[PDB]
Each structure stands twice: as C-alpha cells, then as structure tokens.
Ligand binder design. Sequence first.
Ligand SMILES: CCCCCCCCCCCCCCCCCC(=O)OC[C@H](COP(=O)(O)OCCN)OC(=O)CCCCCCCCCCCCCCCCC
Ligand SMILES: NC(=O)C1=CN([C@@H]2O[C@H](COP(=O)(O)OP(=O)(O)OC[C@H]3O[C@@H](n4cnc5c(N)ncnc54)[C@H](OP(=O)(O)O)[C@@H]3O)[C@@H](O)[C@H]2O)C=CC1
Ligand code: SF4
Ligand code: SF4
Ligand code: SF4
Ligand SMILES: [Zn+2]
Lengths: 154, 94, 114, 144, 154, 95, 44, 294, 206, 176
Amino acid sequence: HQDLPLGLMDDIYEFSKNFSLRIDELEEMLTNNRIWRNRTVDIGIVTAEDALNYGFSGVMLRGSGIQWDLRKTQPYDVYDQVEFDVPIGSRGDCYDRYLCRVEEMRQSIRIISQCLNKMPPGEIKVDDAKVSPPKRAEMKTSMESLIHHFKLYT
Amino acid sequence: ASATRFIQWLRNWASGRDLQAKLQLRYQEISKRTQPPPKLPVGPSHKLSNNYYCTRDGRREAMPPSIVMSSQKKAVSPAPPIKRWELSQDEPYL
Amino acid sequence: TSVKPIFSRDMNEAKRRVRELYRAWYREVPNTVHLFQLDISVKQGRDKVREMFKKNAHITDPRVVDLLVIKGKMELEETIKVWKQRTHVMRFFHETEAPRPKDFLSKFYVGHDP
Amino acid sequence: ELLQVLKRGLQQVSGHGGLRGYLRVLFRANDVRVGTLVGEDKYGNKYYEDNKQFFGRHRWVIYTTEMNGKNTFWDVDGSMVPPEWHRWLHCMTDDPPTVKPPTARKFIWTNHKFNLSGTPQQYVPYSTTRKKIQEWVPPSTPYK
Amino acid sequence: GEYVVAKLDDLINWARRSSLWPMTFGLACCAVEMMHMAAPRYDMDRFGVVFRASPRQSDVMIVAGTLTNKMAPALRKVYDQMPEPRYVVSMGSCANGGGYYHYSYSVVRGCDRIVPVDIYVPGCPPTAEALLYGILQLQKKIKREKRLRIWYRR
Amino acid sequence: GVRTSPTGEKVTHTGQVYDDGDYRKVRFVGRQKEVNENFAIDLIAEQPVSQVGSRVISCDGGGGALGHPRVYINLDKETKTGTCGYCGLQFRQQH
Amino acid sequence: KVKQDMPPVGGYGPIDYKRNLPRRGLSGYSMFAVGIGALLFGYW
Amino acid sequence: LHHAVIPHGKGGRSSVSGIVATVFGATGFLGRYVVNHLGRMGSQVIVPHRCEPYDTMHLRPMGDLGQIIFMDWNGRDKDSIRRAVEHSSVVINLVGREWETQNFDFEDVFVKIPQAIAQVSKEAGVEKFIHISHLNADIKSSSKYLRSKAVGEKEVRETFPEATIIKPAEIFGREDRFLNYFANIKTVKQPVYIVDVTKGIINAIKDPDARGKTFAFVGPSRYLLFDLVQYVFAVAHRPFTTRDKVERIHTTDKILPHLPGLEDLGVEATPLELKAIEVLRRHRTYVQPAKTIP
Amino acid sequence: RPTVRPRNDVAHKQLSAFGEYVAEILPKYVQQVQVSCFNELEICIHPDGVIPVLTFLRDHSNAQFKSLADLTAVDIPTRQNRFEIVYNLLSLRFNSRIRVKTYTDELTPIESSVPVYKAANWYEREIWDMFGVFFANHPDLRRILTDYGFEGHPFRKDFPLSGYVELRYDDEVKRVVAEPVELAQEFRKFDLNSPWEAFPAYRQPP
Amino acid sequence: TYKYVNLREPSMDMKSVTDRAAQTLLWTELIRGLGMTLSYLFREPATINYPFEKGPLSPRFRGEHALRRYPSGEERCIACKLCEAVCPAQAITIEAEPRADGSRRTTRYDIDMTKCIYCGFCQEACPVDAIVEGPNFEFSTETHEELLYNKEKLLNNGDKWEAEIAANIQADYLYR
Ligand SMILES: CCCCCCCCCCCCCCCCCC(=O)OC[C@H](COP(=O)(O)OCCN)OC(=O)CCCCCCCCCCCCCCCCC
Ligand SMILES: NC(=O)C1=CN([C@@H]2O[C@H](COP(=O)(O)OP(=O)(O)OC[C@H]3O[C@@H](n4cnc5c(N)ncnc54)[C@H](OP(=O)(O)O)[C@@H]3O)[C@@H](O)[C@H]2O)C=CC1
Ligand code: SF4
Ligand code: SF4
Ligand code: SF4
Ligand SMILES: [Zn+2]
C-alpha cells in the first residue's frame, strides 16, 4: 500500500541484531530441560507416509524428515534470491517440531538480514493504474488518474 | 542501562551471557520520531512518449485455457524429477 | 431419467428406512427429555416427531427420501451423543415466537406480506 | 555504588519539592522519577522527559488535579491529554507544541473534552435527515 | 450515619475495583491484543488484574472476539456461573456489533444480545492500550457504585 | 447558525429537529443532543470574493496535494461570481 | 533527488543467528567428587 | 397516529410495534417479563429505576439498540415521574413490595405512589394507564397489604378513569414468592402463571375495549392450600417471613364472575401442573397432581 | 516488461504433455484436459472416475501426487449439475500440482475419496455441510462447521447471506433462542459491473 | 539447503556417561535454567506507566474517525460516496442533497463503529481528505448506542482533533 517510512529499516536492523540472543534464552529454558523433553520427546510421532497422505504441510512434514519447503521448491516473490536452510527433523515427534520451529526462527533472522541489505529502490506497487490506485497527488491533478482512482475504489 | 556494576555482573554470571551488549530495552539507538520528508521515485510507466497502454496491458494478455483434449511415445511426468537437496555448509547439524 | 441411487432403489425400500428412523426417534424421546431436563412431556416430544415426519409425507422420489433419512439420522446422532445442548433440542418448538396470523383479515391488518 | 544508588533515591525526594511533593506523585502516579519539564498545557497537565530512560518511559505526563470542573486528583484518564500534546506524548513526533505549535483554525475546539461516556454529556445518536414523506392534512372545516 | 455508609461504600468499591480478576473468552484475533495487555509492556497484573482466572473466581468477563451462533450458548453458560458482582467487557467490533461479519448467517450481531455489557472497547482489534483504557474505565464505573447507600434508603 | 425550536431542541445544520409529538426525543432526556455549532454554510459565506484578472481561474483548495482535485472556473458571466464546486471559494474577474 | 528508506552505503553490520549455548560447569567426575567430599566432611 | 409510532416490520426485535411504554417497577418479578414482551416486538420501553444501574443489567438484552431507555426516579418526586411519562403512549405501574420498610409502608407503595403516577400521567396526556391491583384486595381484609391495595385501586380509578386495572391472583414462576415461598418452608387458592399475566397486560395495551375496565387474572383451577403445598413438596422431592405475608397466603382467593378475566383478553390460562417442575426443579436434591376444587 | 507477468513455455509444454498422458491412460473417465495461461493443469472427469483417477495420480510412478492440498466445491446454479467438485493435488517427487474436477447435483452421491487420501475426511464433511453434496461410504459424514441443527447449506448461491434465523438470549425461557432474522440495517446490494466489456479474449459466441 | 536439528549420537566413553549421570542425579541443567530466571529478576522490566506513559505510535496510526474542513471552515466532504462504496464492512451510510447555497453536501454521514474494521480504506478512497482515521484510540463507551456515529459526532471529532490530524497528515502525505 505504501513505502516504508524513513528510518524503519534502521530500527528493524536494531531489533534483529539482538533477537538471536532472545532465542538463546528461550532455548536455555526448554531445549535441554528434562521436564520439557519428557513432555515432548516421542509424543505425537507421525510417519513420513502418514504425514503426506493426511494432508500435512510445513513443519508437520519436515519434523518427520520430509524435505519440503515451498519457499525452496515453488518459490514466490524474491525467495529464490535469499539464502537459508530448511530445518529437518529425524523422529517426527513434538520435540523435533519444537526444534524445527526454533531453528526456523533463526533462519528468518538470516533472511531478514539479507532483505535489509538488498532492498532496492523504486515504486512499491505496479505502475498500472487500472490495477493499483494512482498516487494522491496524481489523482488531484490528472484527469485519467482521477477516473482510475474513482473506478478502482467503487 | 542504569544497573550497577555489581548487578550487571550478577545477571551476566547467572545467565552466562553478555547481556549488556544486547539489551532488550531500546535507548537512543532507535531512529528519531521526526524524519525529513521523503521524495519517492516513480515507476517505469511514468514516461511522456513510447508508452501506449496496449503495449503494457497485462490483463489483456491473459488467455482462456488451452484445451489439450476434449470429448467433444515416451512416458512423461508432469515435470522433471525434483533434485536432491544439499546439506547445509553453514551448519549441517544442531 | 436414469439416475444413480443413494441408498434405496425404489419407494418401497425408502419407506423401510423411514420407519426404522421413526422407531429410533420414538424410542429416543424419553431419554432426551430426561437427559436434557426438558420441561415438555414425552407425549409433546413424540408429537413433534410425528409432526416433523408428516410434513414430508408427500415425497415420491426415493432419492429425496434417502437424503431426508440421512439428515434425520444425523439429527438423531447429535441428540443421542449430547452434542446438542438444551437450546438446540428446544428449538423445534418455537416458544418465543408469537403465533403469526393465518387468515386474510389478520394478515391484512398487520402489514403487506401474503 | 549502593551509596550512590541511595543518594539518587534521596535526590528524588528533593527533586519533587520535599517529602509531601514526593508522596503526592508516589500516590497519584505510582512513580517518583524526576524528569525535565517540557511544558504545561492550559488544563494544568505537566509533561516531562528523560532521554536516559528506555524508549516508552522517556516521556510522561502528570495530569492536572482539575479539568473542566471535574476533580482529577485521583481520577485521571488518558483522554485528558489535549490533541496538541497527544502527538508528542505518543511519539508520533519529536517536537512538543511548545517548540512546534499547531496551526490555528477558527473552528478548532478551544477547550479539550475527555471521554464523556456515562455522564449527562454523553453522545446520543439520532437520524440527521428530515422526514421523507408528507402526509395529507385533512381540512379543518366540516363538510361530509 | 450517611457518613458511615458513604465510607463503607467507598471501601467495598475500592476493594472490588482494585482486585478485578478477569475470565477471558479469547475467541479470535482480539484475544491476541488481550495477551499483549498481560505482556510485560502493559502488565495488567500490576493493576491487580490477574492474568487468568477460573470462571468461579472471576469478577469480569472479557469477550475478546467473534461470537458465533454455535458458541453463544456456551458463553451464556459461563456468564451464569460467575459469582456476583460480575461485569462484562465487550472487546472489538465483532463482539460489539458483529464487525466485519455482521451480515453472516453464523454470527451473533453483538454479544450484548446474549449477555449484559458494561464496557464496549472499539477497534478491530483495539490496541492493548485501548483495552487497558477500557479496564480502567470499568474501574471508574465500579467506583461510582452506591450499593449500600441505595440499600439504606430502601 | 444553531437555532432552537419552540420545544427547546437545537436545529442541526441539516435542518433536523424532532417535532412536538415525536416520542423519539425521549432519548435526550437526562442527556444531550450532540450538535456541531460551526455551520459550514455560514463559514464559507464569510470568505471574501477573490478578484482576479483572467477569464479562467483554477482552484485546488489550497495546500497543493493536501487540497481537492484542481478545477478551472470560468468567470465570463459578470452577474455572479465563479464558485469552486469543491471548496466553495468565490472568484470574480476584475474590471 | 529521490529519497526513500534504504540501507546505509555498504550495508548493515553482521547479525547473529546461530544457536549460542555455551558450555559451563565441571565434569561429572569433579561434581561427584565435591559431593562425596561434602558427605565425608559432614559424616566426620 | 404520529408517523413515528405507525407499526412496521414483522413484529420481531428490530420491528416497530408503535408502543412507547413507561414501566414503573420494571426491575422486579413481574417487571422483567413485561419488559421482555415489549422489547420482543420492538417497543420503546422507558424504565424508571430506583435501584443501582447494576440491578437493571438483565433488562438490557431485552430490546434492540435504543429501545430500552433508563431513567432515575423517586416515588415521592412528581418531577421525576413527569420526565419518565411525558413522551409515552402507555404507563404501566408494577410498583409494590411484599413487606413494609422504614421508608415505605404499604400506604406509600400501594396508594400514594400509584396515585402520583396516575395523576402525573393524566396531566401529561398519557392515553393508556395499566395499574396492577390484587384479586383479594379488600378494604376490610385482615392483611394491611390487601387493605392498601383496595384503597389504591379506588384512588387510581378516580384519578385516571380510563385506567385499566388488573387484579391477579398469586402469581407463580421461576422468580415468584409463592411456589418458592412454600419450597423454602380452610383456604382455597387459584394461582395464575406469570407468563399468562404478562400476555394479558400486553393484550390490554393493544385492546381498545380494555380502557376503563377492571380485570381479574386467575388460574384455570382452584386448589386447597394444604393440597397445593403438599403437591409442591412432592414435585421438589422435599419430604412432606412476615405475619402479613402469612395473612395473604391464608386468604381464600375471591371469585369475581362480574369481571372479565384472561379469556376476555385472548390468553389461555396455564395450569400449575405444566409449570411447577420448571420452577421447582432447582429445589430438588439430586407426581400425583393436587386435587382441584370444581 | 516490468508490469506484465512473464510467461513460462517450458512448464506449459510439460503440463500439456502430461495432460495428454493422463487422457490416454484413463479414457474411460477423462472428459477434458486444459492448461491455463498461468500453467495450471486441469483434468475434468466423469464422477464415476473419482477413485480410479485419484488412485492413479497418487500411485503411478510417473505421477506420485501423494498430497491432497485441498478439496472443495463450487456452486453454479445455471448448470444441470450445479456442484463442481475440485481436487487439488501436489506431487513432491515431481514438484508439480494438478487439479481434478468432476460434478454432481443435489441428489446424486459422489464416492468418498478417504480411501485414497485420509485428508479428504474433513474436506468432504465440509462440502456436505456447506453445499449438501453427499459422499458415499464416508467413515463419518456429518456437519463440521455449522451449528447443530442448522438447516440448509450456506455456501449455495441461493442461500441468503444472513440466513433465515438469528440467535439471542431470552430471559423468559432462560436460554438462547432462534427466531426469524430481522436486520436493523439491511445489507445494501451494489450493482458494480461496468456495462462495457473488459476482456475481448473471453468473449462468448453470440 | 537443509540442516538436521536433532541427529546426534551421545558419546559412550566413561567420562561422557558419567557426565550424563551427574546431570541426571545433580539436576545440573535444571539448575542452569534457574540461573536464567534469576538474571531476569535483576533486569529492568519493560513495563510502562500507563496512563501517565503511552506506547509509541506513528502518524499512520488508524484510530477514531473524524470529518475534516478546509481552512475556511467549509466541510471537505462533497458527498461523493467513494468511502461508502469501498468500505469493506458497509459501516458507512450517506445521504446528500443540494445545500441551501447549492453546495453538494451530505445530510447524513453515519459510521457504525461496531461494524467498522478500522481498515483505513475510507480515507484512502476520499478524494478530498474529508474522512480520516484520527490518532485517538481511547473512546470506549458504556453503551452500544454511543458507538453509532452520526455526522454531528464526526464533525465534532474533526473540530476536536484537527490540530493533531493535520500534523499527522503533514508527516505522511508524501508517502501517499
Ligand atoms: C561415602 C558413601 C556415601 C553414600 C551416599 C552417597 C550418595 C551420593 C550420591 C547419590 C546422590 C543422589 C542425589 C539424590 C537427588 C535425587 C536424584 C534423582 O532422582 O534425580 C533424578 C530424577 C529423575 O531423573 P529423570 O531424568 O527424570 O529420569 C531418570 C529415569 N530414567 O530427576 C529429578 O528428580 C529432578 C527434579 C525435578 C524437579 C525440578 C525442580 C527442582 C530444581 C531445583 C533444585 C534445587 C536444589 C534443591 C536444594 C534443596 C535445599 C533444601
Ligand atoms: N407477584 C405477585 O404475587 C402479585 C403481585 N402483584 C403486584 O404486581 C406488582 C409487581 O409484583 P412483583 O413484581 O412481584 O413485585 P416486586 O417486588 O417483584 O417488584 C417490585 C417493583 O416495585 C419497585 N418498588 C418497590 N418499592 C418501591 C419504591 N418505594 N419506590 C420505587 N420503586 C419501588 C421495585 O423496584 P426495586 O427493585 O428498586 O425495589 C420493583 O421494581 C406489584 O404491584 C405487586 O403488588 C399483584 C398480585 C400478585
Ligand atoms: S473485532 Fe477484529 S481483531 Fe477482534 S476478533 Fe473481530 S476481526 Fe478479529
Ligand atoms: S476504516 Fe474501513 S471499515 Fe471502518 S469506515 Fe473506513 S473503510 Fe469502513
Ligand atoms: S468523506 Fe470523502 S469519500 Fe466519503 S463521501 Fe465525503 S468526499 Fe466522498
Ligand atoms: Zn476549491
């Protein structure tokens, strides 16, 4: 809808710089806690073949060893231009899916770091006013723009 | 950021981390809440000539489906078989 | 005019499923009244069951009859397993609706609808 | 350092004008921090800042004790902040209305009102359109 | 005597508004903003509003989200189980009047068709702060009560 | 231009007011009828007519992109002013 | 001149993401030794 | 008809019934049923209340947005009564108390207050007035509650001659003090169901022939008090107050054939046998009907 | 061209070849095969072929569509068979998607596909609930999304948006009751279609 | 590219087995978790002192609606009904007619704030900046009826909040 306000990426960088430490603290509370493991390890085991036939997707597949992530196999937008790893489970239980989700949080930071560095210039919506409304300054001076703004919003 | 040296040492030791370098509370490093005005760029269609809509009209290039068989040789798969994923070299194991 | 059936090939077999459904509903009413602590009688509940069955007495299509029995069996499963609550069972009786006028004159006085 | 910590705690008692002023803010606002006075609005609300606090606690307001004839010593409301200070207090801007005043318009309210729900000043909705169909008025004279 | 009754009314009003234990009906997205009100930045517990309470120990019900037809009897059952005095806070457009789903076949057009409502919090969702404003508005409403004064003029 | 009816109720800028026998004014008992006192019709009538030296003048409402769509107003008729259809400001040709 | 939100020239500094759970403490041998030493001192 | 009170819709919650009703004493037993039936059909209900707003909350869901309006009033302040009724087409008086208090005796609640509402309503041009009295109201009763009812019934009739006066027998229902009264423990009783009384009041508002009439609302059957109380214990599975309240319970329900009843208003009286369980189920600790006098 | 979506002829050709492949192998059931301009392959089948066609796509070594992404229905009242049943399948082995469509009416049952994909169990329950299409041999067919005792199938085009009944709490009966729907503000129908044709490429013969 | 989150073999030397026995019997990893909550006890909390302190917001924030004016005091709204048309919730109701001076103005402008989803589409669609979502978010009410805004309420919101609304628009209009 709009471009990023000036100064936002600086604050996203500042947030991202410290976030992996927050993930580490979460891991200190759960990852090796025997109570957490007793609650999660070997709970809800799903086999690879059951997962596919029941229609599972996402971590419900990767927890069971299936190597599938649509951002890699059927990429959209600019996901083919970023580098990241897909976490894969080995036991297909609640504990491995917990680990997958924690590791996916780390890989999201890795991607966010690349988006911040590679953000290009230019417009932020398709320059086709039969689809995307024109800028407000254009809508208030140019006749074609006003018509297209009127019709897009009615 | 106002914690005493002893309290900073105590919580660093208990956590096993240099907490003071990555405080979860923001101070002056954030960007100012008043910013200079932007001047945003325009798109590729902002031209005064050589810019007829019929040459850049995506919606009018859409076509009805191609009918390959209607009720009125080597075997093939829908696409080539997917390629094996490579183990990460950044960090293959946790 | 040749069609794939649901459960019944003709009205004769459809009517057999209808009667079995009615027997199940008839025998279930006493449990429903007690389980849901309803404030109606068993006679009132069984009268409603007859009323619901009778309103479809005019169907001559075994496929429509089959779907009516399927839906009636679904409605019974919800009641027997207590998936319904008191509010769901009691909705059959419309005890907060004022009786709408029936004759021409009464309808003429209140508004424009037929 | 524990002596410096205790000295600073004592400096808050004097920073608030003595024990009474320290206790008043402690009980009105549950906060005894001393900031820099940024300004005061016509209703008596006072605005403070301390940029050494973390983002979010670096600006605050001590509400007036009376606003539009309502005793607000204990009953403070977030809607008592007038619009010109509202922008500063929520960090939508960096500059307070004492530095960058709002543009004056004749029609802008001279007196801010807080939330009036539950009182005799509450808004009551109603249709703003006039009657649509005019009925025939029979003659006042008799003639059947 | 009127001075004693006025003070007794003030005492019980102060205790009841200083100790509001909510039962949250987290039905949809508005529940997330309720979570952010319990989170560290706003810390509802610092006002004496405990994070979570069982229905039999709760003083205020917060309807945080869309109330469908299927759900309505369950919500009314929980309201009838709350010990008195009990208050209801309707949070967000869905609970206030149906919101985005006002015209759906499966949605109650406002929870106030099912339970009496004390405070309406607008927004889709209301911000965590806006909900906190509503809770503090409920407290001021309780501060206005004159139960003992009205009792002794009976 | 808030005028009040014989029953004491304020008349809004849209001309609305409950009449004498209308039960609906019970909603205001113990409360108030919210009325905006700044009648835009009376406020625009205060602005002066702008004297210009052209047959055609444009109005964007002021403030550039913060105003209204820019329109051009003909000032050929000398028996009336040119009024902006968006903001109501008036113009007249000099001499 | 166009002005929109952009990264600084040269990009941002490195951001950490890999798990960092450091190793701490003594070996199992030393921990049992301190425990058993404490028991023997207490018994004595 | 003023254009705003012409009925519209199908008689549901969002419809316009055309009734603008002020209901005094709406926060008690009978009040909640009357307000519910008015709001069911889209009537504008004005609720003057003496109690805390907290005690009026159960009435809010009973009407579409805007249709239930609440006002403060005082029984001894005629200015507050005038504020409540001056916009209404009908005034309903349900004020009463089963016991006397230091501030309000039976003369205040059954004579002075009803007279004040009737007079102020008359002055304000209200066209319909419904006043609830009592079947056993009697100037020479041994119960001061029933003596005051008879005096007030007379004062209302002269002050508002077109008033509809309704005289119900003891009313039973979930929130009654009749069946519940026995459950918490010579004379014949004819108790009437709460919903029948409400339907009668609503029909009286809509019936033009009801103006100026006095009605007696009684149940279909008469019972011996002993047999009735026995029946209540059996239904509750229970093994078988003030002095004034005992007097009323021991007053035989009068037979008044010269007054119209529920039948004249289109209401079919509901037997006590169909509704006792609904009221008395909460008294069970987890049935042969009573003998009826013919 | 910056604003136009680029075509992909390689994928279009591959999907066209596989579409013929399927039509040759299951001529008993396949009625139509088409590939859209954005490269999605659709196999239209006779409803008798649901189980055979799905089993072949799941199990054939040159197909291996092991994942049922979604199963839904579309109501088109102008058709004699108003309900279009759509299966969207995913093949991880070949990184491809395919769509299988069939049809039924209000009274003709469709064979349940739970034997092929266990995912179908809840999807078919939702279709029955929302469109009233009956699935034969379903392990447990019953409503899933609507309230208990709800009458009608809301997602049919002729079912009104706000339905026929609405709920409220009634104090007299001390429970939630259902009543005919009345709306304080009626939903305002908008006539938005431009009377001028937008897409000549899709013009129908007059 | 992928990695394994849990594919490891514990060492079975005596030193490793004795390490794990000590962890089992001395609760070492549980004691480690205690250390982390202890470190938080001595950290400064994140809580702000509401309502004396407020959470930060931006000029784009979508709050309570208001109807705006031109500097002359004339209403900006010219009853075009684009806002009504675009509203995803059908929360806007508009009637209009020629004003006594011939101006194209509304006679009704209602927003049901309990239908509204606070999406901001109305202020995007408005060609004259007449309808905006303001910065106010503290307007909860005690009754449902108080949230059915008519034109008088919305004009009063515009006059009440214009000082802040205009400044916020000044900060963000070059992004629109
Ligand atoms: C010279 C000869 C002398 C002879 C004597 C020598 C004896 C010394 C050697 C033996 C020492 C034994 C220590 C006894 C402590 C209990 C040991 C124990 O049972 O821990 C194991 C227990 C279960 O282990 P688990 O991993 O869950 O499963 C194993 C089964 N397959 O796991 C647990 O119980 C974990 C506890 C769960 C609760 C966690 C909450 C507590 C964490 C904080 C603890 C703080 C320390 C307590 C201090 C108390 C101070 C009063
Ligand atoms: N229920 C019965 O068995 C029968 C009842 N009636 C009559 O029906 C009417 C209502 O019956 P019921 O509803 O059972 O009575 P309730 O006591 O249940 O309700 C009494 C109503 O009167 C109001 N009220 C009482 N005293 C005052 C007062 N001093 N000033 C203002 N309001 C007051 C109460 O308001 P608050 O809640 O504020 O106290 C309440 O709304 C009464 O007139 C009663 O005599 C007649 C025959 C039988
Ligand atoms: S009001 Fe908005 S945020 Fe809240 S539940 Fe409804 S849609 Fe979600
Ligand atoms: S914010 Fe969205 S839902 Fe609300 S009035 Fe504007 S367009 Fe409608
Ligand atoms: S507020 Fe704006 S969009 Fe809505 S009717 Fe007025 S001018 Fe048109
Ligand atoms: Zn203009």
